[PDB]
Design a protein around this ligand. Structure first.
Ligand SMILES: [Mg+2]
Ligand SMILES: [Mg+2]
Length: 114
RNA sequence: GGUGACCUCCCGGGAGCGGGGGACCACUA
């Protein structure tokens, strides 16, 4: 099958819960509370990531397994390409999933819309 | 020493996740 890091099925995943400052680690938060943000949405994540030059796409209706509430506000997952077909980084600034999460968390509060 | 809450950091992974170091509290010979 098509399994290089440039194939969409191998893009990394970011769910809103990973950056939410009101969730515990058990609930899915992946970055420190100090750096996390309030109520991040998948759309805001897509926007800040796309703005910095990352190839990303939004799956608006995918839901996070640790979240029992299926309402639209809890939905959305962003897929991010980290590496090229040959395995090298798309952007030196983003060597990892963590690097992308911290970046989005940093930018989202700066959205004119917030 | 065990087990759990919660926090922090590291490694791995396309998800669900996997592997660890350290805090702090709880219950506990
Ligand atoms: Mg730990
Ligand atoms: Mg882990």
């Amino acid at each position: 099958a098509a399994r290089s890091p440039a194939d969409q099925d191998r893009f990394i995943c970011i769910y809103p819960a990973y950056l939410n400052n009101k969730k515990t680690i058990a609930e899915g938060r992946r970055i420190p509370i100090s750096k996390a943000v309030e109520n991040p949405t998948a759309t805001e994540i897509q926007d800040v990531c796309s703005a910095v030059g990352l190839n990303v796409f939004l799956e608006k209706n995918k839901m996070y397994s640790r979240e029992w509430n299926r309402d639209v506000q809890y939905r959305g997952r962003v897929r991010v390409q980290l590496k090229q077909e040959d395995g090298s980084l798309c952007l030196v600034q983003f060597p990892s999933r963590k690097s992308v999460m911290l970046y989005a968390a940093e930018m989202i509060p700066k959205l004119k819309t917030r």
